[PDB]
Amino acid sequence: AHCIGITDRDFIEGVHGGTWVSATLEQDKCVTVMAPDKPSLDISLETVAIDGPAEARKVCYNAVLTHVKINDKCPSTGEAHLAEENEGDNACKRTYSDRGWGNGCGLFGKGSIVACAKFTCAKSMSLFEVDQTKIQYVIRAQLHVGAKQENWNTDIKTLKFDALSGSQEAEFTGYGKATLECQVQTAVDFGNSYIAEMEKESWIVDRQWAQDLTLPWQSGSGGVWREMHHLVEFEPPHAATIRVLALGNQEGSLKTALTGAMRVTKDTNDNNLYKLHGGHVSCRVKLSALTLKGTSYKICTDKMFFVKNPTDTGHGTVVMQVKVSKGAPCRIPVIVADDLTAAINKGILVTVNPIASTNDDEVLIEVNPPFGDSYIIVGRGDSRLTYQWHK
Amino acid sequence: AHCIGITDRDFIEGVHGGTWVSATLEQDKCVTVMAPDKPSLDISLETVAIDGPAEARKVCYNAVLTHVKINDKCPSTGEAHLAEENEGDNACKRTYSDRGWGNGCGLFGKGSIVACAKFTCAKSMSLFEVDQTKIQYVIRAQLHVGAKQENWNTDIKTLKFDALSGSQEAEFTGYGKATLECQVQTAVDFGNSYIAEMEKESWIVDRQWAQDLTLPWQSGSGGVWREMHHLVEFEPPHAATIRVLALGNQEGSLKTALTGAMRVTKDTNDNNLYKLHGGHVSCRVKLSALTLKGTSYKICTDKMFFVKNPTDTGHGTVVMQVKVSKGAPCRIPVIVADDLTAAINKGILVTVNPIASTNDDEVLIEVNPPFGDSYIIVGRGDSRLTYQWHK
Amino acid sequence: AHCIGITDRDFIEGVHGGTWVSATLEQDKCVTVMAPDKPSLDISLETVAIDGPAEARKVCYNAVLTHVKINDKCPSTGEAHLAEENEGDNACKRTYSDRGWGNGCGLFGKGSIVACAKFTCAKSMSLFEVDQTKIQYVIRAQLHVGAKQENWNTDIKTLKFDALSGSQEAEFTGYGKATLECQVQTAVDFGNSYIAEMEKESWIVDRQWAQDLTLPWQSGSGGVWREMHHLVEFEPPHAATIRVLALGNQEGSLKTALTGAMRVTKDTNDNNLYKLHGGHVSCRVKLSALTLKGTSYKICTDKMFFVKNPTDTGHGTVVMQVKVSKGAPCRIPVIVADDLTAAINKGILVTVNPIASTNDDEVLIEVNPPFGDSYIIVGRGDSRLTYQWHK
């Protein structure tokens, strides 16, 4: 029961006549649903993932400049020009300067000057356009059949949800089945966002914010960088030669600005899905079709032993592993009570009807004790297993 | 001489100690200088000019759009681009079209679309640098030697000026010489300006106005038209479809906007030279080296004949033309008075000492009469020419 | 002289005789000094510099982590040491982690984790301490030498001006001599402050702000980096694992903080020199040992010609250039007046007594006309090279 493994867990109880019970699932949390005569069920959101985005824009975050060129003319010998102004891959600026005879000039006054440089991206952030139909929600489920730890990763059923897969049927061998309906149409707001990627790291960000970055960018299809001056400073002109400098690598500033956004991992092993951190989804469980497998079986009227002692969990419930011997397929009785007279059970089980199907079975049990001192009890007759507990 | 012809005229009268006399010459006007025992001098500003100024800019005012191309992308497939977008002689615009199944995209929404057009200029205005140092100007001058209107064009003295040689000298044959110190063409409007040329006409305009024209322009050295979006227009998008047009030829709007400027002319017959209008020049004339040619000669004594009657100039002088046919080179006496009987002269002889230069000769004479009724007289004796006149 | 060739200039007036004159030399400006008989004087800084200062620190701005490993212990079993945790070359963090049967561990609770990584600096600032004792200065001086601007580069008085070397004398010919005392040990405010170097660019800033940089740093050449956790992120532990990453290149963020600092240039050739910007000096200058030259040579009357007509410096004063062809040694006169009568000079002749030496060259002349209407006048015969001026 993998919710036992999860640090943050919520129990949910169905009304005796209810049919659907609903819960919110979010990645680091887990939920256990319980109903009065049916095996309890763990549910959790494993990942929200998205397949095959397409690039909208590349944004350059460190420019490098080459082949600087300059031209200048004297204060009344007409406007300066440079052939580089014609070329889209040249960043460029025009301005006046003071000029005087010592420059190789002919007059005193406001000369006219141009400089350009070949602009090239070294590294760039990629903004991906987000496919609002290819989102997938991945839910894990399992029943409290009471299987030992090492079996859990094989006994979970993995349900993948999307707008087509609007309801899913979870089948549990010999325990019947559950049906599950999660609200994918309204779980998240991706339509206003991009997946922003930097090398081996990524975020999901608002389209408006990204388009308002003060930073030079290019179409995903390729083209020409088209706000180049945002990364070039022209040092105001010394009258013989202006000079131009790259504004330096922005990486750390940029990813400082992203700190508010939700983290995303590109999974290089799982095809090329982008996996969101910290998404959530709302969902209904339908419980009618589950049944308590072993209800038929006789009580286990014979010796037992703990494979692991009853042990605390942060959830405020004890967990134990019990094994039988000389036993048929049979029902393990369990109670929690004030003293070994055991007149009134006060504990409420999570593993609703503990069973062994074969004498070599190794059975996990989880139970919520009342507050205060109490004795946990397993089995019946003078062979009772018993264990003291406090709160 | 030609101050007779020029409609707007000033008289300058030198006090005896004024070896120099100041004058202001204004481009349409004429000045007559008079001094007590010295021949009077007409003087006149003929031209103000710039030789071969440099082109600052060309401004396009009629554009046409040879090629057009469009690229478009569906609402979740990223930004469009074009190869032309990289190439400097293409105007371009970025927008989103609406898109949907009716136009081949898989999703309803707004799709990126970009269009570009190859721009070219049909006609452009040229702007030129006004070097305040290079302003040439030309002065006309004549003594009142009293020659026929037919002879002024031969007898005219022309004085050229530059920022160099502000002193200039006019000799007059048998009359001596005078010298002009001309201060610069005072040019009070011509700083911070361009000469604007547009086909067969031109204007001088301030730099700020010109640079603030909402029109595409390039350097005089040639290059790339820097603000093409003033003259291309893009219709709002339709699916996968932009219509682009030039704005109409702007010539008329530009001519009308320029109407307040001082107009400029090109001396197209002679030179690559631009001739201004509305100049002012201040000069001073040294008079002392002028002399009167015939003061030694005998008084002309035989009968004379009017080639032209006395007539009003409209300047309030009267002008006359007189023929002699007897007697060697001699002084022709002229006076104007009230009495027909022997009378003291009242008027000022603008032509101060009229003379015959040959036995059969024709002479022009100009006089400022007194106010009121009078008789004007030429010749000494019995057969005086005499003429009725008033104010 | 060359203080003409600079946008900002100032004019200081001394007094007759022995007096020292106060001056200032902020590194961009060039300043003019004059006195009622001594010629005018032009001075500027070349540079303020340090040679081979001492490293205070290196500060890393881009770390990379090359080995990572981890140790983890079940909750009751007590804290994890890890062998490299004492190795100064490794960054480390120690934190508890949640553990339980989903993690191969005996009891549910807070396990312990330690994780460490081998830190390496990839790129870093170098910081150099400076002491006023090591400040070099270099200064330019000129008066009215009459050298070609083509040769100022070799005429120019090149005062190397290290505070641990003797005061220096203006070694001019024919103008007497001058000397300078210039607060050389004490003009600056660079205390408690030091040079920061990036790749091929550099800045000067206070040691306090540098100490307050939240970045890992190293004192000596080699030795342990002091605060590596400022560039290592440890993602919160999960199960038996932690993931650690470099915080990414800070270069751009760091440079963004430096924009208000005064700039520095490490030299291109004497590669251990650092040339400071924004320095300044204040001086007193010994004018009284200077002389005019040719003070009683004849007032010239030769026929005389401009080579450059009166040009506004922008300093509120005029420059011009004049040539002559026979008065080769003679005193070229100039004055300024209300009228060409020139009864009195009314302006300040910033070259007070110009010196001719060749027929080949133009002489280089400056003048300051009074506010309002006036005539500038070169020569004083009828060879009046005269020009109207205004405020």
Author numbering:
A (entry chain B), B (entry chain C), C (entry chain A): 1 to 391
Would you copy out the relevant sentences from the publication that reported this structure?
Yellow fever virus (YFV) is a re-emerging flavivirus that causes severe hepatic disease and mortality in humans. Crystallographic studies have resolved the structure of the YFV E protein and shown that its domain architecture is similar to related flaviviruses, with three N-terminal ectodomains, known as domains I (DI), II (DII) and III (DIII) and a stem anchor region known as the transmembrane domain (TM). Here we use a chimeric virus platform to resolve the first high resolution cryo-EM structures of YFV. Stark differences in particle morphology and homogeneity are observed between vaccine and virulent strains of YFV, and these are found to have significant implications on antibody recognition and neutralisation.
Given that DIII of 17D was critical in improving the particle homogeneity of bYFVES504, we next examined whether swapping DIII between bYFV17D and bYFVAsibi would have a similar effect. Remarkably, the bYFV17D/DIIIAsibi particles most closely resembled the phenotype of the virulent bYFVs, whilst the bYFVAsibi/DIII17D particles most closely resembled the phenotype of bYFV17D. We then resolved the 3D structure of bYFVAsibi/DIII17D to a resolution of 5.5 Å. The symmetry expansion method was also used to further refine the ASU of bYFVAsibi/DIII17D to 3.6 Å. Similar to previous ASU maps, the bYFVAsibi/DIII17D ASU map shows lower local resolution at the icosahedral three-fold axis, as well as no clear TM domains for M or E. This cryo-EM map was then used to build an atomic model of the bYFVAsibi/DIII17D ASU, which was found to be highly similar to the bYFVES504/DIII17D ASU model with a Cα RMSD of 0.85 Å. Furthermore, incorporation of YFV17D DIII into bYFVAsibi also switched virion homogeneity and FLE mAb neutralisation sensitivity phenotypes.
